């Protein structure tokens, strides 16, 4: 391999250098924005508790104030 050893080793070295270049070149940057995760709850109406107000008396009418 007197006339084969040189070009093969040259190609091997060039491939190694290209691989190193490709790997490290992309590491820079790659983190421009930060996006926080979202964890919401299911907004549904199943078995809602029911509150009832009742006003009654011997009078005809009344004035009523209440808290919703």
């Amino acid at each position: 391999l007197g006339r084969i050893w040189l070009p093969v080793l040259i190609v091997v070295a060039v491939a190694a250098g290209a691989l190193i270049v490709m790997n490290v070149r992309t590491v820079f940057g790659s983190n421009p924005v930060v996006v926080t995760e979202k964890t919401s709850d299911n907004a549904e109406d199943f078995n809602p508790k029911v509150v009832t107000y009742e006003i009654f008396g011997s009078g005809s009418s009344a004035v009523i104030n209440y808290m919703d």
Partner: protein, 48 residues
Amino acid sequence: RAGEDRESAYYTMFHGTAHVVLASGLTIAGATLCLHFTRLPYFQTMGV
């Protein structure tokens, strides 16, 4: 200084150092051209 005349001295000089000067220049040129593969503009604009 060895004793050769000026013609033979010139040809000996060229034969003995022509390839070395070229190789040194190629190493210097190729090394600096590797700056073209960096990411910062300050380094990259020096390669070519």
